[PDB]
């Protein structure tokens, strides 16, 4: 249990988001911000980033790609734990299939969870996916405030079973891969503000990249992947989802759920995996503390990270 070496590599890996501004003359230009340098009499930046006057809409773009790196550890000291883990993932996909996790990630891509506080004060936003490998025209999700609200409402779309099935083949098939390109249109009001990411300094300086000479804000690479992994709704007496860490950390209200006293963190669950291959070789599985722990373990191997001593 917990050798010197154990490490997994991540399955989902997204990229930076890029913001552009569309004009009524039918073009698009990058979005720029400004600092103001606060001087004394005879230093800290303050950055502001607002939508320019007379525009039409904001277009955001990024690209996410799902892979199969969860089926075998990147490192392992002992040929005793790897056998357990590969048949753990094999019994999980035999008994209780990949559709819950796949739908629960694709919902967070399709509604704009990665538009962190940018859809407050917004009229309509429209998300378009371009998947790969694929044959057909693009997969559109239109006006997510008043047309897409729940899991039953997404399933009444034309192109949903194919998207969740290619995510299932990516998580299942060894040497398998799916790639989605995402771009989303935001119709913000006149002179609405924009909230990108902020650099770590110990005020309010933005994260930026250069797009063809103009600097632009991005809203993160690691931030935008912490919004596709807000799926943790299985902790004891649950009410509200979480980023899938190992110690159930809710960010703003400082405290951590899933403390190791409760035994519902990753290590207390992981060290009882011979019980999970015990129960999943039977003929009935309870959905209250056995399915809700296999979901947490499989969502926490997809994240990756080194499980050492």
């Amino acid at each position: 249990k917990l050798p010197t070496n154990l490490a997994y590599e991540r399955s989902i890996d997204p990229s930076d988001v890029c913001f552009f501004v569309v004009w009524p003359d039918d073009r698009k230009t990058p979005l720029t911000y400004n600092s103001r340098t606060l001087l004394g009499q005879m230093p800290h930046q303050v950055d502001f980033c607002h939508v320019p006057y007379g525009a039409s809409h904001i277009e955001c773009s990024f690209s996410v790609s799902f892979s199969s790196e969860l089926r075998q550890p990147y490192k392992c000291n002992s040929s005793k734990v790897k056998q357990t883990l590969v048949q753990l993932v094999e019994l999980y996909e035999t008994k209780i299939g990949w559709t819950e996790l796949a739908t629960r990630y694709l919902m967070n891509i399709c509604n704009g969870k990665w538009l962190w506080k940018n859809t407050r004060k917004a009229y309509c936003w429209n998300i378009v996916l371009t998947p790969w490998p694929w044959n057909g025209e693009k997969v559109g999700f239109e006006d997510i405030r008043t047309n897409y609200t729940s899991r039953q409402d997404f399933k009444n779309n034309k192109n949903w079973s194919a998207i969740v099935e290619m995510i299932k083949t990516a998580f299942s098939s060894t040497d398998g891969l799916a790639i989605f390109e995402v771009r989303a249109t935001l119709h913000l009001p006149t002179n609405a503000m924009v909230r990108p990411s902020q650099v770590f300094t110990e005020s309010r300086v933005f994260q930026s990249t250069t797009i063809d000479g103009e600097r632009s804000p991005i809203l993160g690479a690691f931030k935008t992947g912490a919004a596709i992994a807000t799926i943790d709704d299985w902790y004891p007496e649950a009410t509200e989802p979480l980023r899938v860490g190992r110690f159930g950390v809710h960010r703003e209200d400082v405290t951590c759920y899933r403390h190791p006293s409760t035994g519902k963190d990753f290590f207390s669950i992981l060290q009882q995996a011979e019980h999970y291959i015990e129960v999943l070789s039977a003929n009935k599985t309870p959905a209250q503390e056995t399915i809700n722990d296999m979901h947490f373990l499989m969502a926490n191997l997809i994240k990756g990270g080194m499980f050492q001593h």
Partner: protein
Amino acid sequence: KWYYKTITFLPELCNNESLAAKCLRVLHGFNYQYETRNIGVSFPLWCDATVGKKISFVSKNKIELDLLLKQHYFVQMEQLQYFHISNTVLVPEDCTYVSFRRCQSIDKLTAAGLARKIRRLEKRALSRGEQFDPSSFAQKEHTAIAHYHSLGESSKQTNRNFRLNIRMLSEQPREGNSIFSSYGLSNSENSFQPVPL
């Protein structure tokens, strides 16, 4: 040939700008009787923070002062020891003649400011020419703004909420018999008066 006094703020538990601003609010409460525009506000301390522990209003000829200092505001306030209106002392002539102007460029640096400015700029395209696309008036992408202090007041009959700004130039003592516009600063620009320390 006239004089200053210090309304001192001493409760030793107070924020200074938010008392000084409503002192200037009740200064604007005065001078609706008719436009007797003869008052300077004259904040005698000015650090790189903290608008001073004092305020020092000026009058002209010793009696208009106590029409201003009975401004329906300290009469129900000064039962106890919180402020101190200083008692009408002819000026010691060892001070410095400094300025107080509302500069209207702290207020028009914001993105709302050039939004208003560009929407005015073809509000009055009525000298009819070829209309521009507004896709090129990109803002000042790096700006070094100097020191300023802000006072939080509001509009005189409407619910419009601006602020007002103060700087501390030093300039040219002798000029005229010192009228201004309404509430107390020296951005009149017909007679831009220094009112001393």
